[PDB]
Design a protein around this ligand. Structure first.
Ligand SMILES: N#Cc1cc2c(cc1[N+](=O)[O-])=NC(=O)C(=O)N=2
Ligand SMILES: N#Cc1cc2c(cc1[N+](=O)[O-])=NC(=O)C(=O)N=2
Ligand SMILES: [Zn+2]
Ligand SMILES: [Zn+2]
Lengths: 258, 258
């Protein structure tokens, strides 16, 4: 059979080729995860077709209906065989799907407009002149919320009662708010995205300080999948071959603009 | 049955307590992995006994006999139920034992004696005045060896023919050679170890440059062990609870001397 690989339109992981209107199948797409799926399928010896997730979501369980959305849903309800995407390895997800060992590391990070006098979380917490927020619904907001940790507890208090709202509907909106804030807004988001935006014109943003946590993205397969073991080993092999670092350099820095 | 947990005397993961003659069993030991084993056993709901690996090795396969030594061997041949140690997740190992998702990240890093005019790998590669090397057997050496990569190829060519040998028998030997070589030797090693030593008297070493690769330590179990699933979910929960970061800070920085 041709294996179905669910993925997500997130730059630079999966993006449309310029004339994608004119193209067919896997040829429609390019990016880090396009390259990754290609290399994995080579080592696992499978034919495959990329499938863009229909709701544009990674995967969360609705607190009410208990239905999984996004790519996680595609795996659990049997539409996709594997997810190759920047899907974060988390406890609730690992309970319902299997992940490979991480193909990329990351953590919560601070994005500022260049020139903003901020160099760390501690810098943000003590002051109020510069506003800061996060995505309104993800895992970054949860880190601060479910964080029994000093300075981050102070940050959460501020964010939860801030006026108006410092939580953004999308990651992209957060980024735009930093850019248009004249230095009065900072945004917390995945380090990999922060690093990516720092490489986009007009080069007006910067990542500052260390990461506040540590996580990995993994390739996902359903429980009991015949592919699980061949996918895990392929990811380890690619790391040791230097491919994964080569792909990150390619899409972040060789193709960067700053 | 009481679970056998194999581990290794490596500071600050597992170390003897002050008057250890006077103590018995698990009470003899303290450290990052002592604390980690206690937390994992708590979530997995098992009674356990720490056992220091007899040969004091992590684990490698003899190229002639094909027999595994170290903690890897203890798992593979049936003498230990879990290894709770800074055991590097690698393809050849994952082929024979199971690993949790990483509890700690790391990469190849450069250790210098303070004062040495080296800030990066590129700095080492373009000169010969200041000698540099790695452990004579492990993944740091193999990174360079099997690295079809520009500056690293140049570094491998140098180290391969350096006279006398720049490869050390032990990591501790490499660290001593940095300290005693009056600014003429730099050592390449695990970033976590580099960072730890930087925090120890007499505070004469420094970690410089970014990491050359990316890897993780994992908690290991025998292939197909019934304990694998819960150990992995335990590590993920501990990370999400912030407790892995708390342990790192405790053993590296709160207990630091520099
Ligand atoms: N890149 C990236 C991202 C990858 C993500 C993400 C958000 C972002 N992001 O927008 O920064 N949320 C997730 O729940 C996830 O599994 N993976
Ligand atoms: N710390 C530590 C270390 C942890 C290690 C190691 C060397 C060191 N070291 O001496 O730096 N070699 C390994 O093969 C391993 O699985 N784990
Ligand atoms: Zn279109
Ligand atoms: Zn390949």
């Amino acid at each position: 059979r041709t294996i179905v690989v669910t993925t997500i339109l997130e730059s630079p992981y999966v993006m449309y080729k310029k004339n994608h209107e004119q193209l067919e199948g896997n040829e429609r797409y390019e990016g880090y995860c396009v390259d990754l799926a290609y290399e994995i399928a080579k080592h696992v010896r499978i034919k495959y077709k990329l499938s863009i997730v229909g709701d544009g979501k990674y995967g969360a369980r609705d607190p009410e209906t208990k239905i999984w959305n996004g790519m996680v849903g595609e795996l659990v309800y049997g539409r996709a065989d594997i997810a190759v995407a920047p899907l974060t390895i988390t406890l609730v997800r690992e309970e319902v799907i299997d992940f490979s060992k991480p193909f990329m590391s990351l953590g919560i990070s601070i994005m500022i407009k260049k020139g903003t006098p901020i160099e760390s979380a501690e810098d943000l917490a003590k002051q109020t002149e510069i506003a800061y927020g996060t995505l309104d619904s993800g895992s970054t907001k949860e880190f601060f919320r479910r964080s029994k940790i000093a300075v981050y507890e102070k940050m959460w208090s501020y964010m939860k009662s801030a006026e108006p709202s410092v939580f953004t509907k999308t990651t992209a909106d957060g980024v735009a708010r930093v850019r248009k804030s004249k230095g009065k807004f900072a945004f917390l988001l995945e380090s990999t995205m922060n690093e990516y935006i720092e490489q986009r014109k007009p080069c007006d943003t910067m990542k500052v300080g260390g990461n506040l946590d540590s996580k990995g993205y993994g390739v996902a397969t359903p429980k009991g999948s015949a592919l699980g073991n061949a996918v895990n080993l392929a990811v380890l092999k690619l790391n040791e071959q230097g491919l994964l670092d080569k792909l990150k350099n390619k899409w972040w820095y060789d193709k960067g603009e700053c």
